[PDB]
Structure formats: structure tokens, C-alpha cells
Amino acid sequence: YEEKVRPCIDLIDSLRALGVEQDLALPAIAVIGDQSSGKSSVLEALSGVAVTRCPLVLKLKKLVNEDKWRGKVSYQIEISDASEVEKEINKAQNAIAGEGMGISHELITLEISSRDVPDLTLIDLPGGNQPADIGYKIKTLIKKYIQRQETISLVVVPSNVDIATTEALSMAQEVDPEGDRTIGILTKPDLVDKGTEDKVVDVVLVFHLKKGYMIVKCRGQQEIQDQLSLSEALQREKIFFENHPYFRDLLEEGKPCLAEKLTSELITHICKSLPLLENQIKETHQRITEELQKYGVDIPEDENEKMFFLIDKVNAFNQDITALMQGEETVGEEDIRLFTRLRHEFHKWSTIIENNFQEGHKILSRKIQKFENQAAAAELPGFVNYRTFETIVKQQIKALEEPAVDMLHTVTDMVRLAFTDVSIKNFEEFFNLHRTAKSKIEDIRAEQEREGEKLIRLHFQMEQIVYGASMEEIFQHLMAYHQEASKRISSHIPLIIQFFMLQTYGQQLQKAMLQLLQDKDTYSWLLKERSDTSDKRKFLKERLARLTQARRRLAQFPG
Amino acid sequence: YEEKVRPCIDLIDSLRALGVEQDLALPAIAVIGDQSSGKSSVLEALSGVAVTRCPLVLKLKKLVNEDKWRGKVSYQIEISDASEVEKEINKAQNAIAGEGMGISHELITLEISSRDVPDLTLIDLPGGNQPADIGYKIKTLIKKYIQRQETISLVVVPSNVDIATTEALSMAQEVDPEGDRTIGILTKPDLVDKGTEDKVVDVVLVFHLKKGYMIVKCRGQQEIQDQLSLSEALQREKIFFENHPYFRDLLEEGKPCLAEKLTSELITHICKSLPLLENQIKETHQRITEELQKYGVDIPEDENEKMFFLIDKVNAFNQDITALMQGEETVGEEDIRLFTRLRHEFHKWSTIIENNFQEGHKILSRKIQKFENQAAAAELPGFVNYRTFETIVKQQIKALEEPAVDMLHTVTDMVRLAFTDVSIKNFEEFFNLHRTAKSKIEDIRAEQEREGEKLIRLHFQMEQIVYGASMEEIFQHLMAYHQEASKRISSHIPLIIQFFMLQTYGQQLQKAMLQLLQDKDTYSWLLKERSDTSDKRKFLKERLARLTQARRRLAQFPG
């Protein structure tokens, strides 16, 4: 029972000092008291070596070995020198402190070895106008710790004070209604009024305590440079409680000996707090872990290791590009494919052409009947510059040139965005990636549209120039031209379009992507991520590693 | 009768001296005789002023005016100096002659004025080893004149010689069988053997003469530097024939007085020769003229006058170019138009396509049945890479790409020559013109073929890339592609061809022609002609102008 109880705290100690201290229902022994409290007087006699600017991981124990050594860490020596043990606080503290009377949230571990130092773990804390800085900075820190159900409370006040309004009680009242988790000690009895006198005390009361009290003494406070011995100042104070017919009879209940009492409570607290500890933590992991499952496969470091990843993303992108030109792409429910949307426009085109067909037909048919009736001349070569009549055909076609270009455009627009929304939905992260893509994506249109238009426009020139190549028969023969003309177009524009703007664009885009893959520097630059992803995970990473260590040594606990 | 007869020869004289002497049935009085003949002795007494290197247009007449003047032309003065009259022969002659004893075909007119010089027109001519030069050059000239039916002959030989073989007779024998067109005179009677003596003479015989003879004398030949008078050497010789009981009695028949006899025969000859003269010449013109009708509208000279002509030929050329692209060009009987020839090849093309249609169909149909039967697997995704099956379609089309180009070529060839044969048949002359055309004609093909091919080749790329866009149904659906594919081509290649190679080529050629028209120098250089046309006409021009003058003064002849 003894053996285990002791390295029992041991684990908790190492938990926090290498911790992981954040996010704790975690319990330890926190000490509080005002500058007058005389709490330091306790710690002095507890260490033998005893300013404050942060919590002090006070770690002591008794292993029978040698003249005990002195050890401490400042940021994440065995000289047997009590004097130097205190001479580092004033330096270390001021490091965060800045040589001023300052305070920091941070901590500094302090572990001592001896065969007269009682085994225990405590964390002390620091001690008329406005506005106050440090004064508030102190009364705030004490509020942070004790606000937790498993933490403990330690108050220091003299024997003869307002026991009811001991500054400590007010603090205990602010956060503790249970009134069963607070221990208090009463100093410097010999400064009391030569006994109980007018004030009964016997505090060892105002409030009932689960664990109780104690009434040690500091002896004479005056010996500031006098330097009475640690082991002789405490063994001397022995005789004190061996006189007074009040503070003497209690040698059986209340007592130097805090060690026997104190360590006992710290150990018996741990076990109390471990039951849920495990449940909450090992459970905490499943909750944290799931978040990372969600994203965060991470960027590699080998120049070689690096590249594969980009050859992964360049490749995929293109896959999705191909699947648009292939027609065979992933489309949501109720939604249309790219290739599908096209054929509509393409059918429309043909429609529009058909419109011109009848349109042109009629007017032609009309323009003949009426201008025919003119006649009104002698039979002679005639008849109104028939090439003229032939030109009436072309007129209709030549009309379609502009519509054409139009259609090209509205497509290039569909493709443009298609490709674009493929980059978005692939490169939300790597905004440098996405950018570099945009250039290509938009960039290319330029070319493939520019060159694309040409052909259309040209084509139609061919249709004008290349002429063909019974008064009523002529209709038929001239109609056959238009009947014929139209067909080509209907089928050709779409081919010239669908070629340059779908197909060519793509093979060209893909290949533009691939070209990324030629330079070392580029990779690092491509691979950036918004801090929303990089910051957020990295923090999430850090927790999981510290958090998991916990699980391990908790489940590892031999007890 | 007298008045007219005299300016009668006058016209003939001026005819030849400004003539036009070439191509003559023309008659005049030609004198001949060897160096010994003593013919000069006659001319001496005829002029009074009398070396030879060419025929001498001896023109004299008696107009009662003043002390008679002396005139002559060398190449096409009135000093009254007989001495200088002879002193120019030795200079003039040597000009063509070269200061040597030489001979020339050319002539030198010599016209004298007096009131003691008998009116007449005569043309004298020049006087032992091999090979002889001048000696032959003389006996050849005499052969050139007298070889004509209207020319006349004049021989000079002494009284006492071989009358039968007088050198002159031999010449008369060589070209004259008629023996009715020859006159002869006998000199230096006083060198005769103191009369008839052994030789009768009385020549004034061996050969009967239409006009007869004469027997004048030179007096004493010796007076080389003595210088007896012209009018006193001839009037003195009078007494001679007034002694001898032989050469005296003939004063009635034969006689200085040659003038009265001679002029009379020259005049009476002209009239004889004029009858056909007119017929042959005025007729000659209709024969010559027709040749020029045949060609020779001539190049102008104004910088302004110049240009119009080229704007004529540049324009025409193009007309003919247009008429090929228009289809409406001039084609010979049994022969095809350009545009006509094409449509054959174009129909052929479609044929060739049709071939591939069934060709491809069957094999496709075949390749499906057989590879289908394979089956031999578990029902699973399958089935042999259908895109694979789809690629079997393209295979057939992709086959047509090369055939295409071919067709383009064989056309460009037809057009190439078309255009070429249009330049030939227009610019046979102006070979600089034709050349400059060739560059353009061949030159352009380059471009229009080069650019032309591209599209074809490209087109077919579009056909590959742009894919579409029930085990038996597939046939139909995949066949519809090929059914469809083919149609475009059939109609498109021909359009892309007929565009670049007919139409575009032409508008481009025409416009290349026109560009000629920007520089001054060019015109002269363009406008050259082969000498076959330039030489040949120019000579033909020259004849017509000289020849026509003839007609004019002939018809003008007041007689």
C-alpha cells in the first residue's frame, strides 16, 4: 500500500511536468496565501533552502542514499547548496519576469533530494491605488486553478486573525460551496497573545473540514540574516507546544509533521480522481482523432518523396479533365454532363439553321415571283443579273457567319467554367496550384478560341466564293444549293467547335499541367496551404501526441 | 509630144534616186565597156567636165538660163567649175572605196545643168593572175543590171577590132538572145588604119539592131594634160567625117549628135515599159499589204500613250483567267472545259470514298463476327477494348488522308497548266511578259497549295479526334458514323480544293498581274518582241512607204 501510493503521485508529477497539463480535471496540491500569510515560512521549513513569479512545482522525497542533491528546470545541478537553491529563482523568474516585479502563467519545476525532506508534491503561488496590475494578476491566478473539482486548496493565516474572514476563506467561498476540499494551516503561534487569551482559536470550527487543519510555527520571524538551522528550528519549535495549557493538549489531534499528514492526503486524492480520469481521456482520444481522419495526409520532405505527391495531383486533375471530353464524368443527381449540355446547343444550332432554311426559301420564292412579273421588256438577253438571283442564296448563309462565332463563344464559356470548376473542386487548397492552373485554363482559351474562330469565319468564305459548282426548275436547282449548303454548316461548325474548344483545349491543358513537373523549388511553393488547414491541424497533431502519451502511462500504471 | 517626153524620164529619174530602185522591171540607160573601150571618152564629151567605183547616175539637161551649174549627192554646189566636178569622184568613191581601188553596189547621183549639155539620163560603170578580186567584182555588176527585160545595154569598142568578139558582144550574148535591145558606139575613128583599108567596118552588120549604131571620135587620146576644149574638140571632129570616102557618106545615117539619137530612145523606151509597170506595182501593194494586216499593230511612245496598251493586255489575260474559274471559257470542238474536267475527278473522288465505304463496312462486319465468337471468358466487363472497335472505323477514314492530298495535287496540276496555256496563247510575244507571268503562275501555286494542303490534312485530324459525339445495333450506330463521316469528306475536300486551287489562285494571279502596272521603266522592258516579229515587219513597213510613193507619182504622171 505504501510503496505504490508514493510513485503513485510520481506518475501524475511526470504527467504534468512533461504534460499535457492543459485540459485537466487534474488534481495536485496548490498552495495559496497573501504576502503576510506566512505560507513561505512553511515552505522554508519544508525545503530547508528557502522571488515568486509563477507556480512552483515543489517536488521532494526521501530516499536513503547520500547528502541530498538540488535540482530544477526553467524552460522545457547537484552542488548540495541550499544557498544556491534559492539564488536561481530570482534569476530564472526574472527571465520571464524581465527584472521587474512581474508575473507569468508559465511554470518552473523544482525537485529536491534528501533523507530529511518529506516526500510530496506542491505548487506554491505569489503573495493602495488604482489601477493595480500585479495585485490583480495574482488574485486572478489562484482563481484559475481552484475552479476545478479535483484541484485542492491550501490557505495560510495566523492563529489570531479573523478566522471567519481570513483572506483565504473569501477565496474558498468564491469557488467552493462543497466546503469539503479545503485544508488550512496556522502559523507563528508564538506571536499569538500568549495563548488563547481573548481569542479561543482551537481552529485545529468556523467551517467543518474533510481532512482538517494543523498549527505549526515559524519560531522568530526576525532572524532575517540570523540563519537558525532548518532541522533545529523545527525540532526546537517542538518544545513550544509542550508548555501552553491550550496548544499542548492537541498534540494528539493537530501538530514538521505536516509531511505525514499531507503526503497522505495527496496520495489518497489521486486514486479518488483516477476513476473517471481514464474514461474521459481514453474517450477524449476517439473524439480528437476523428477530426484528423477528416483531412491532413501531410506533405512529404524528400526531394524524391516530395515529387510523387504532385505527380499524384497533376495526374488526377487531368483524369477529371479527360472525363469531360470523354463525356464520361461524375455528375450529380438531376444534373447534366458537359458533353450532354453541348449537344443541346448543337441541336439548337441546327434548328437555327433550319429557321434560315424556310426563312430564306420563302423570301427567295417570293423575290422571284414578284421581280419575275416585272418582265415588261423585249425578249432579250436578260434577266436582272441572275448571278444576282444566285447571290440572294448566299445572303442567307453569309447571315449565319456571326451566329456561328456566337455559338463558339457560349461553348468556350461552358468549357471554360467546366475546366475551372474542376480546378476549384480539386485544388481548394494549394492556392498557388489553383492559380497556376487558372493561367493555363483561361490562358489557353485565348489560343484555342482565336485559332478556332478563324476556321469558322474562313469556312464561310469558301461557301461564298465557291459558286455552283426551265423557269421553275431554277428554284429547285438554287434550292438544292441551300438545301446542301446548310447541311455542311450544321455539321461543320460543331465539329470545328467541339474540336478546338473541348478536345484540343483539354489535351493542351493536361499537358500544361504536366509541365509543372520540371523544377525543384516549385514544389515547396506549389504545395502551400491556408493556415486554416496548416495551423489548425498542426495544433491538432500536437495534442494527439501529448494526449496519447497520457493514455499509455495511465494504462501502464502499475497500480 | 516633146515637152512631156522629157520630164517623162524626169519622173523615172526621181523615182530611182529617191527610190525604191529595188524590185524593178525598171528600165534606164546603163553604159558598159572595158578599160580600153574608150567609153569614158564619150562621157567626157557629154559632160565637158571629165575614178569609177560604182554606178553613176549621169543626169543632164538643157534649160536656157545661165552659165550652167554642177550638182551631185554622195549619201542619201553651183561653182561653175568643171575641174571640181571630177575632183569629187576620187574622194566620194574612196569614201565607200577606202582609198584603194575598190568597188561598191551603192550609187552616187551626178546631175549637171547647161545650155550646151544634151538632156538625158545614163548610168556608167567601171572598167593577169589568180585569184582576181576587182576584175571579177566588175564583170559581175554588169550581169546584175542587164539581166532584166526592160534594162538596156550600151557597149563601147573601137572601129577596128574583132566586131564579132568585141568584149561587149560576149556580155550581150550571155544575157541577150533577143538581140533587139542593144545599142553600140565606135570610138576614135582616126586611130583606124587610115580608113576601112583591110577592115570594111561600116558597123553603123554582125548583128542587126532595133535602134542602130553611131561612130563618134575622141580626136587625139594623147592630150592627157593638153586640155583641148569640150565644145571645140567635138565641133572640130566634125571635119574628120568630112574627108574619108567611107566614114563620110554615112553622115545621113550614122553620126556630139548621140544626144538627139540617144535621148530619143530613152524616152521612147519608158512609155514601152510603163504599161505593165502600173499593173504589177499597184498590184504588188495588195500582196504586200495583206501580210501586215496579219499582225503589227505597233507599240506606242507616250509615257501615257504607252501604258494604256499594257492595261489592255493585263486586263485581257485576266479576262481569260476569270473565264476558267467562271467555268465559262472558250473550248475547242470535241474538247473539255477546265471546270468540266474537274467535276469528273471530283466525282471520282466520291467514288474512291464509296469504295472505302463498302470496303470498310465488310471488313468491319467481318472483324466483329469473328472476334465476337472468341467469347471464351466469364461474363465480365469486356469486351476487347470497344474504343478498339470504334478505332477500326477511323482506320478506314484515316486512310483517305493521303488520297486527298493526291487529288489536290493532280488538280493544281490541271489549273497550273490551264493558267499557263492561257499565258502562252496570249503572250507568245512579249517573252519578258510571259516570263514575269510564269513566276506568278508557278509562284502562287506554292502558296495556295502549301496552305491548301494544311486544311485537308488538318481536317482529317478533326475526324480522328472527335469521337461520337444491342450487339447488332452497334453495327448500325458505328456504321452511321462512317455513313456520315464519308459524306463530309466527299463534299469538303473538293470545296477546300476548288477554293484554294481554282478560285483563290486566280484572284491572286490576276491581282499579281495588275501590280505590274506601277513603274515607268518596266513598260519598255515588258514590251519587247522577238526580232522575227520586229525585224520582219520593220522591213515590211519600209517597203510599203517607198512602194506607195511610187503608185502615187505613177498615177500622178501627167502623161
Side-chain angles (χ1 to χ4, degrees):
Chain A
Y1 161 104
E2 295 302 326
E3 295 153 14
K4 292 179 65 174
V5 297
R6 317 178 168 182
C8 174
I9 59 176
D10 193 315
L11 298 156
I12 304 300
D13 293 347
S14 307
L15 190 145
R16 299 175 66 254
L18 278 41
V20 72
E21 183 183 18
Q22 307 173 36
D23 315 316
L24 297 178
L26 187 147
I29 302 165
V31 196
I32 74 175
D34 59 303
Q35 188 60 47
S36 299
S37 63
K39 65 181 177 182
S40 184
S41 156
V42 195
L43 306 171
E44 180 192 58
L46 273 44
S47 62
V49 297
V51 183
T52 301
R53 288 292 179 267
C54 78
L56 184 278
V57 187
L58 204 60
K59 290 198 291 197
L60 297 179
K61 291 185 181 180
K62 175 179 172 307
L63 182 292
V64 203
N65 172 28
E66 294 173 353
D67 294 64
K68 57 171 179 310
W69 60 90
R70 304 285 183 267
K72 293 194 281 182
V73 58
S74 175
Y75 167 86
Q76 183 187 338
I77 186 65
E78 291 82 359
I79 186 169
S80 186
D81 174 353
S83 303
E84 269 201 334
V85 181
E86 206 280 310
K87 297 171 91 290
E88 186 52 46
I89 290 81
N90 308 59
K91 183 174 186 170
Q93 293 300 55
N94 281 225
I96 190 68
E99 198 169 61
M101 300 183 75
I103 61 82
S104 200
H105 50 80
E106 200 180 308
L107 267 62
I108 295 179
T109 314
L110 167 46
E111 185 184 310
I112 293 168
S113 74
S114 176
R115 59 184 151 208
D116 60 11
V117 291
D119 44 48
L120 188 56
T121 308
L122 304 164
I123 39 158
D124 196 60
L125 301 172
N129 188 48
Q130 301 169 338
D133 179 2
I134 290 294
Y136 291 96
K137 295 262 202 148
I138 290 183
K139 288 205 182 182
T140 60
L141 189 147
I142 57 80
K143 290 184 176 182
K144 297 149 72 82
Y145 274 136
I146 201 173
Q147 81 144 60
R148 308 169 182 176
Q149 291 74 2
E150 295 85 354
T151 58
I152 68 88
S153 56
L154 192 63
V155 299
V156 196
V157 291
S159 306
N160 50 16
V161 290
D162 196 290
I163 54 177
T165 65
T166 77
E167 184 54 19
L169 295 185
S170 188
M171 291 185 182
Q173 294 175 4
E174 282 189 331
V175 63
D176 299 355
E178 179 59 20
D180 295 352
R181 60 183 295 180
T182 308
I183 291 192
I185 66 178
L186 280 72
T187 187
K188 61 182 68 183
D190 72 4
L191 283 186
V192 307
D193 55 348
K194 301 66 175 183
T196 293
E197 292 304 341
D198 54 13
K199 181 177 173 55
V200 291
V201 184
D202 310 354
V203 175
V204 70
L205 182 71
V206 177
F207 55 90
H208 56 264
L209 298 300
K210 188 187 192 302
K211 303 190 188 301
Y213 303 75
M214 293 295 299
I215 304 185
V216 306
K217 64 188 299 185
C218 56
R219 184 182 60 87
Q221 70 284 2
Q222 76 192 59
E223 297 85 356
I224 306 196
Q225 202 153 14
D226 203 332
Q227 288 162 347
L228 189 53
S229 54
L230 168 65
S231 58
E232 301 296 305
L234 291 172
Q235 271 292 324
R236 179 166 178 174
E237 89 160 55
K238 170 60 193 174
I239 292 80
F240 167 66
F241 304 94
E242 288 298 79
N243 299 51
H244 196 42
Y246 288 117
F247 297 141
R248 174 160 150 286
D249 303 336
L250 47 73
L251 180 275
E252 302 174 312
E253 190 284 347
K255 178 170 294 193
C257 187
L258 176 63
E260 172 71 350
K261 168 62 186 311
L262 180 56
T263 72
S264 179
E265 304 315 320
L266 178 49
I267 302 289
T268 54
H269 179 51
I270 285 186
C271 313
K272 288 201 175 198
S273 56
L274 274 170
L276 65 81
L277 191 283
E278 289 189 359
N279 296 1
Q280 191 166 13
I281 168 168
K282 295 179 182 183
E283 177 283 319
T284 195
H285 214 280
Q286 202 175 350
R287 188 188 72 86
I288 291 170
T289 185
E290 64 191 18
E291 297 167 32
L292 290 68
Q293 296 191 21
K294 283 224 161 199
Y295 61 91
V297 175
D298 183 62
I299 286 58
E301 300 300 1
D302 273 2
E303 304 301 347
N304 181 318
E305 181 187 2
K306 186 158 61 179
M307 173 188 332
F308 177 82
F309 181 85
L310 274 67
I311 309 174
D312 283 16
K313 306 297 291 189
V314 171
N315 195 0
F317 190 47
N318 303 331
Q319 296 169 324
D320 299 313
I321 269 74
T322 298
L324 283 173
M325 320 175 302
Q326 211 96 32
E328 59 189 54
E329 102 261 17
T330 209
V331 198
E333 66 168 51
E334 324 285 331
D335 281 76
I336 288 183
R337 319 193 95 66
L338 185 37
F339 203 76
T340 297
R341 271 218 308 286
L342 275 51
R343 300 308 322 263
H344 295 338
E345 310 303 309
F346 282 121
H347 182 62
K348 281 197 186 187
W349 174 235
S350 41
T351 277
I352 313 156
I353 322 293
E354 179 55 17
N355 288 132
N356 180 352
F357 176 41
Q358 306 303 342
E359 164 197 311
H361 164 286
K362 268 293 174 194
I363 51 190
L364 179 276
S365 325
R366 192 222 90 70
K367 190 72 75 172
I368 291 170
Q369 281 215 353
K370 196 161 181 185
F371 285 86
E372 178 201 359
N373 288 345
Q374 289 296 78
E379 292 185 321
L380 205 65
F383 297 154
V384 200
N385 188 212
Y386 161 93
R387 152 149 172 181
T388 291
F389 296 100
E390 183 175 18
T391 294
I392 307 178
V393 191
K394 269 114 178 178
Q395 185 166 2
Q396 299 298 128
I397 297 91
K398 190 62 180 183
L400 291 80
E401 178 151 23
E402 271 315 283
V405 164
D406 270 291
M407 215 217 95
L408 152 69
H409 283 314
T410 55
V411 166
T412 77
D413 283 20
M414 304 187 309
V415 170
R416 186 204 95 52
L417 81 75
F419 281 49
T420 301
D421 295 45
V422 172
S423 189
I424 282 287
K425 284 172 192 162
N426 283 43
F427 305 172
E428 73 285 0
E429 314 304 10
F430 298 96
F431 292 101
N432 289 332
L433 208 85
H434 199 283
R435 289 172 195 173
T436 299
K438 275 301 279 276
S439 86
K440 276 53 178 297
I441 298 105
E442 271 298 345
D443 177 56
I444 307 172
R445 170 146 174 241
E447 170 141 84
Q448 280 317 310
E449 192 155 326
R450 147 180 285 93
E451 169 58 26
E453 202 184 304
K454 162 203 170 160
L455 294 182
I456 319 314
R457 308 297 288 272
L458 169 151
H459 179 289
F460 272 96
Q461 306 311 334
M462 288 185 310
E463 284 295 358
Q464 308 314 325
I465 282 209
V466 201
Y467 29 71
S470 300
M471 294 162 49
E472 174 66 348
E473 290 285 346
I474 283 190
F475 183 61
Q476 295 171 345
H477 290 93
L478 272 190
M479 202 70 197
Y481 183 93
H482 183 27
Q483 162 69 259
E484 171 195 83
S486 318
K487 297 313 132 220
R488 281 184 294 273
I489 286 163
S490 171
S491 47
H492 290 94
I493 304 303
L495 211 147
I496 302 169
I497 281 173
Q498 185 167 301
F499 174 76
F500 286 103
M501 285 342 279
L502 190 86
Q503 215 66 47
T504 310
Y505 200 112
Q507 295 171 320
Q508 290 324 301
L509 186 29
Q510 309 177 180
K511 288 186 186 160
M513 291 290 72
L514 291 182
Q515 294 301 162
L516 299 168
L517 289 181
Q518 315 169 236
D519 177 64
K520 298 303 293 172
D521 303 35
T522 315
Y523 296 138
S524 313
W525 184 88
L526 287 187
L527 297 175
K528 186 60 180 175
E529 307 168 290
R530 76 216 259 180
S531 304
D532 173 321
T533 55
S534 185
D535 281 349
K536 284 178 181 179
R537 72 172 66 196
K538 172 184 170 181
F539 315 92
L540 294 190
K541 165 294 168 202
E542 281 189 32
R543 272 210 188 179
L544 200 60
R546 92 174 187 265
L547 186 71
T548 182
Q549 288 308 330
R551 181 170 189 187
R552 294 191 184 196
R553 290 177 61 87
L554 170 59
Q556 141 168 323
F557 191 31
Chain B
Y1 161 104
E2 295 302 326
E3 295 153 14
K4 292 179 65 174
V5 297
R6 317 178 168 182
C8 174
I9 59 176
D10 193 315
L11 298 156
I12 304 300
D13 293 347
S14 307
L15 190 145
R16 299 175 66 254
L18 278 41
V20 72
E21 183 183 18
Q22 307 173 36
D23 315 316
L24 297 178
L26 187 147
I29 302 165
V31 196
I32 74 175
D34 59 303
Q35 188 60 47
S36 299
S37 63
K39 65 181 177 182
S40 184
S41 156
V42 195
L43 306 171
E44 180 192 58
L46 273 44
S47 62
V49 297
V51 183
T52 301
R53 288 292 179 267
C54 78
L56 184 278
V57 187
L58 204 60
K59 290 198 291 197
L60 297 179
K61 291 185 181 180
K62 175 179 172 307
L63 182 292
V64 203
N65 172 28
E66 294 173 353
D67 294 64
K68 57 171 179 310
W69 60 90
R70 304 285 183 267
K72 293 194 281 182
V73 58
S74 175
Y75 167 86
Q76 183 187 338
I77 186 65
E78 291 82 359
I79 186 169
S80 186
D81 174 353
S83 303
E84 269 201 334
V85 181
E86 206 280 310
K87 297 171 91 290
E88 186 52 46
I89 290 81
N90 308 59
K91 183 174 186 170
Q93 293 300 55
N94 281 225
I96 190 68
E99 198 169 61
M101 300 183 75
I103 61 82
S104 200
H105 50 80
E106 200 180 308
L107 267 62
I108 295 179
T109 314
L110 167 46
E111 185 184 310
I112 293 168
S113 74
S114 176
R115 59 184 151 208
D116 60 11
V117 291
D119 44 48
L120 188 56
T121 308
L122 304 164
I123 39 158
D124 196 60
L125 301 172
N129 188 48
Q130 301 169 338
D133 179 2
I134 290 294
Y136 291 96
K137 295 262 202 148
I138 290 183
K139 288 205 182 182
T140 60
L141 189 147
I142 57 80
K143 290 184 176 182
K144 297 149 72 82
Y145 274 136
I146 201 173
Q147 81 144 60
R148 308 169 182 176
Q149 291 74 2
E150 295 85 354
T151 58
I152 68 88
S153 56
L154 192 63
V155 299
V156 196
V157 291
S159 306
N160 50 16
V161 290
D162 196 290
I163 54 177
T165 65
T166 77
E167 184 54 19
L169 295 185
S170 188
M171 291 185 182
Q173 294 175 4
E174 282 189 331
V175 63
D176 299 355
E178 179 59 20
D180 295 352
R181 60 183 295 180
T182 308
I183 291 192
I185 66 178
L186 280 72
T187 187
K188 61 182 68 183
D190 72 4
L191 283 186
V192 307
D193 55 348
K194 301 66 175 183
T196 293
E197 292 304 341
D198 54 13
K199 181 177 173 55
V200 291
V201 184
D202 310 354
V203 175
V204 70
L205 182 71
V206 177
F207 55 90
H208 56 264
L209 298 300
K210 188 187 192 302
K211 303 190 188 301
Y213 303 75
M214 293 295 299
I215 304 185
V216 306
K217 64 188 299 185
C218 56
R219 184 182 60 87
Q221 70 284 2
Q222 76 192 59
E223 297 85 356
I224 306 196
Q225 202 153 14
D226 203 332
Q227 288 162 347
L228 189 53
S229 54
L230 168 65
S231 58
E232 301 296 305
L234 291 172
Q235 271 292 324
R236 179 166 178 174
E237 89 160 55
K238 170 60 193 174
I239 292 80
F240 167 66
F241 304 94
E242 288 298 79
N243 299 51
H244 196 42
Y246 288 117
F247 297 141
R248 174 160 150 286
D249 303 336
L250 47 73
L251 180 275
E252 302 174 312
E253 190 284 347
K255 178 170 294 193
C257 187
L258 176 63
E260 172 71 350
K261 168 62 186 311
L262 180 56
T263 72
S264 179
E265 304 315 320
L266 178 49
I267 302 289
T268 54
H269 179 51
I270 285 186
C271 313
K272 288 201 175 198
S273 56
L274 274 170
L276 65 81
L277 191 283
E278 289 189 359
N279 296 1
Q280 191 166 13
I281 168 168
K282 295 179 182 183
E283 177 283 319
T284 195
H285 214 280
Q286 202 175 350
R287 188 188 72 86
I288 291 170
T289 185
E290 64 191 18
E291 297 167 32
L292 290 68
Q293 296 191 21
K294 283 224 161 199
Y295 61 91
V297 175
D298 183 62
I299 286 58
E301 300 300 1
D302 273 2
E303 304 301 347
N304 181 318
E305 181 187 2
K306 186 158 61 179
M307 173 188 332
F308 177 82
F309 181 85
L310 274 67
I311 309 174
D312 283 16
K313 306 297 291 189
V314 171
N315 195 0
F317 190 47
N318 303 331
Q319 296 169 324
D320 299 313
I321 269 74
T322 298
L324 283 173
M325 320 175 302
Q326 211 96 32
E328 59 189 54
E329 102 261 17
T330 209
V331 198
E333 66 168 51
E334 324 285 331
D335 281 76
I336 288 183
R337 319 193 95 66
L338 185 37
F339 203 76
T340 297
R341 271 218 308 286
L342 275 51
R343 300 308 322 263
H344 295 338
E345 310 303 309
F346 282 121
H347 182 62
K348 281 197 186 187
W349 174 235
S350 41
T351 277
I352 313 156
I353 322 293
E354 179 55 17
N355 288 132
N356 180 352
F357 176 41
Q358 306 303 342
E359 164 197 311
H361 164 286
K362 268 293 174 194
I363 51 190
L364 179 276
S365 325
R366 192 222 90 70
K367 190 72 75 172
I368 291 170
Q369 281 215 353
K370 196 161 181 185
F371 285 86
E372 178 201 359
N373 288 345
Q374 289 296 78
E379 292 185 321
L380 205 65
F383 297 154
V384 200
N385 188 212
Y386 161 93
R387 152 149 172 181
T388 291
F389 296 100
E390 183 175 18
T391 294
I392 307 178
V393 191
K394 269 114 178 178
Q395 185 166 2
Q396 299 298 128
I397 297 91
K398 190 62 180 183
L400 291 80
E401 178 151 23
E402 271 315 283
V405 164
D406 270 291
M407 215 217 95
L408 152 69
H409 283 314
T410 55
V411 166
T412 77
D413 283 20
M414 304 187 309
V415 170
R416 186 204 95 52
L417 81 75
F419 281 49
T420 301
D421 295 45
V422 172
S423 189
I424 282 287
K425 284 172 192 162
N426 283 43
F427 305 172
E428 73 285 0
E429 314 304 10
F430 298 96
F431 292 101
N432 289 332
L433 208 85
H434 199 283
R435 289 172 195 173
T436 299
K438 275 301 279 276
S439 86
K440 276 53 178 297
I441 298 105
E442 271 298 345
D443 177 56
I444 307 172
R445 170 146 174 241
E447 170 141 84
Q448 280 317 310
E449 192 155 326
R450 147 180 285 93
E451 169 58 26
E453 202 184 304
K454 162 203 170 160
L455 294 182
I456 319 314
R457 308 297 288 272
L458 169 151
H459 179 289
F460 272 96
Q461 306 311 334
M462 288 185 310
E463 284 295 358
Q464 308 314 325
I465 282 209
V466 201
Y467 29 71
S470 300
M471 294 162 49
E472 174 66 348
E473 290 285 346
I474 283 190
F475 183 61
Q476 295 171 345
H477 290 93
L478 272 190
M479 202 70 197
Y481 183 93
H482 183 27
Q483 162 69 259
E484 171 195 83
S486 318
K487 297 313 132 220
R488 281 184 294 273
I489 286 163
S490 171
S491 47
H492 290 94
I493 304 303
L495 211 147
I496 302 169
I497 281 173
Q498 185 167 301
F499 174 76
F500 286 103
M501 285 342 279
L502 190 86
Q503 215 66 47
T504 310
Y505 200 112
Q507 295 171 320
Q508 290 324 301
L509 186 29
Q510 309 177 180
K511 288 186 186 160
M513 291 290 72
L514 291 182
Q515 294 301 162
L516 299 168
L517 289 181
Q518 315 169 236
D519 177 64
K520 298 303 293 172
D521 303 35
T522 315
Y523 296 138
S524 313
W525 184 88
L526 287 187
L527 297 175
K528 186 60 180 175
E529 307 168 290
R530 76 216 259 180
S531 304
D532 173 321
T533 55
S534 185
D535 281 349
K536 284 178 181 179
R537 72 172 66 196
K538 172 184 170 181
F539 315 92
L540 294 190
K541 165 294 168 202
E542 281 189 32
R543 272 210 188 179
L544 200 60
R546 92 174 187 265
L547 186 71
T548 182
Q549 288 308 330
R551 181 170 189 187
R552 294 191 184 196
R553 290 177 61 87
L554 170 59
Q556 141 168 323
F557 191 31

